[PDB]
Structures are given as structure tokens and as C-alpha cells.
């Protein structure tokens, strides 16, 4: 039974990585929101 | 040990820094790692001395 | 203490019409 999550570091970084968020303004707002909440992990860091 | 070396010329300041880094900083570090150093307070004292000399060099050279 | 997650359909699909 193949499950939904099939890990891949390259796909994870290129999809939800820090640079991916900064590319668009919506991603920048995502980072801004999580800085405000004080989350330790801003994004998925390798 | 702060104003004693304030009036020396830049040539001696570089010389004293080199021997501070050369001896009592590298040698003490090797002694501590090998366990032959019992007076560990020298390490911090030497490190602060190196900082003091560098502070003088910056306020002497250039600005 | 904590609510379950799967929450399968416990009722059996057999209508008595």
C-alpha cells in the first residue's frame, strides 16, 4: 500500500523551502506570519 | 597591564601580539588538551591580553 | 483523554426500508 507521503529532500526544499517562500509576496506573508507567532522553524530547513 | 603598552610604537605592538599568540596561547592550548596543564586560569588571562593589544592596534592604525 | 482520528463509519450500510 503506497502511502501519500513519499519523502524527497529536493522536492521538499524546492516546494516549501525558504527561497521558495521569498519568491512570491504570498510566501513572504507566510514567513511574516510565522515570525509574528514566534515559531522556531520558519520553514522546512534541510 | 592596560596603559603600560599604550605608549609603545606599532612595531612593538605587533611583536608582542605575535608572541602572545605564539607562546602562552598555542602552547597553553596543547598543554590543556594533553592534560598537563593544572593552572587553567592562564588560558582566559592570555586571551584577554590578546584582545587588549588588538584594541590598541585599531585605535592606533588608521583612525 | 484524546479524541480518535480515523473516525470510521461505525453504522453499517444496510437500510431497512
Amino acid at each position: 500500500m503506497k502511502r501519500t507521503f513519499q519523502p524527497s529532500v529536493l522536492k521538499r526544499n524546492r516546494s516549501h523551502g525558504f527561497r521558495a517562500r521569498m519568491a512570491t509576496k504570498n510566501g513572504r506573508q507566510v514567513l511574516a506570519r510565522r515570525r509574528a507567532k514566534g515559531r522556531a522553524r520558519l520553514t522546512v530547513s534541510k | 597591564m592596560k596603559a603600560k603598552e599604550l605608549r609603545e610604537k606599532s612595531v612593538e605592538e605587533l611583536n608582542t601580539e605575535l608572541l602572545n599568540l605564539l607562546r602562552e596561547q598555542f602552547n597553553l592550548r596543547m598543554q590543556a588538551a594533553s592534560g598537563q596543564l593544572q593552572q587553567s586560569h592562564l588560558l582566559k588571562q592570555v586571551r584577554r591580553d590578546v584582545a587588549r593589544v588588538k584594541t590598541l592596534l585599531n585605535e592606533k592604525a588608521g583612525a | 483523554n484524546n479524541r480518535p482520528v480515523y473516525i470510521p463509519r461505525p453504522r453499517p450500510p444496510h437500510p431497512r426500508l
Binding site: - | 605575535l18 599568540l21 598555542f26 596543547m30 590543556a32 588538551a33 594533553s34 | -
Partner: protein, 93 residues
């Protein structure tokens, strides 16, 4: 020029262990800790000057710090770099 002071900081400490001892007595090589960057050229120059010995080649590797479970807390050790330095027929330390 800060090459002299740089060479005085790349070397951190010697490494003591069974592998270190057997390597020294057999291969005439010393294993020691270096700075995180510590390029092979810098290590080679530092050993030549500070220890006043002749060296043949240097091999470096990076050791990842272990994850330790101290008290109620989880911690990690710092990564460090160790270098194997192969001395020539003439050895001092």
C-alpha cells in the same frame, strides 16, 4: 598578511585513542584536531612551522557531533575536523 597568526589558530588539539596510537607507531602519522575550515594547505603549513617537522600529505575528515539526552533535555555536540598528517622518515613528536 595574517598568515602567521592564522597558522597559530588552525591547530586546536591532538587526538588520543587506540586508532591514533596504532597509526603513529605503524604509519608514522599524527592525528590532531583542527578548526572547522582548516584547509589542507593551512594544516600542512602549520605543522611544518609550529612543530618544526617535515610532512608528506594531510588527510582531513569532519566528525558530526553526537546527539545526547542530558537530564530532561536533548542536546547536540559541535562538529569538529580531525586531520591525519603523515610525517616523513624523520619524526619528532
Amino acid at each position: 598578511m595574517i598568515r602567521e597568526e592564522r597558522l597559530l589558530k588552525v591547530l586546536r588539539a591532538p587526538h588520543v585513542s587506540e586508532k591514533a596510537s596504532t597509526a603513529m607507531e605503524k604509519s608514522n602519522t599524527i592525528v590532531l584536531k583542527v578548526a572547522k575550515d582548516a584547509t589542507k594547505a593551512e594544516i600542512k603549513a602549520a605543522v611544518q612551522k609550529l612543530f618544526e617537522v617535515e610532512v608528506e600529505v594531510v588527510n582531513t575528515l569532519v566528525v558530526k557531533g553526537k546527539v545526547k539526552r542530558h537530564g530532561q533535555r536533548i542536546g547536540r555536540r559541535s562538529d569538529w575536523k580531525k586531520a591525519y598528517v603523515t610525517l616523513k622518515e624523520g619524526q619528532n613528536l
